Amino acid sequence: VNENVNASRSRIRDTDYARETTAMTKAQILQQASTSVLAQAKQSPSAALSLLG
Amino acid sequence: VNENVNASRSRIRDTDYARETTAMTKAQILQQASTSVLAQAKQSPSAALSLLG
């Protein structure tokens, strides 16, 4: 019973490194994707003053 | 009566070296199987190290 409950708690409490590592990597690529567009986003007012100002 | 009682007692209590030695050797092989599989089982979390690393 001790083994069986140990494996049962693993399936609901322990983390899956196969999925969690992929989940973090999807977020890290998500970071640099959002930071890069953010870098290109604040140049919208840069087009404003370069227009005539 | 003493001779036949002694023979009966041996059949009930006295050990059988032919059977006991086989059980001892089989148990010895069983433990050596268990230590080998346990050694390979301890490295299972190490397979989880490669994903994030």
- Asked if A24's CB is within 8 angstroms of B52's CB, the reply is yes
Name the structure determination technique.
cryo-EM
Among chain A, residues having any CB pair with chain B shorter than 8 Å are: 17-18, 21-22, 24
Nearest CA in chain B to A19: B51
Residues from chain A that touch B48, judged by Cβ atoms under 8 A, are 17-18
Q: Which of A14, A29, A19, A11 is nearest to B52 (CA)?
A: A19
Joined together, the tokens standing for residue B36 give 């080998």
- Cα separation of A26 and A32, whole Å? 11
**Which residues lie below 8 Å from residue B52, measured CB to CB, with a gap of 6+?**
A17, A21, A24
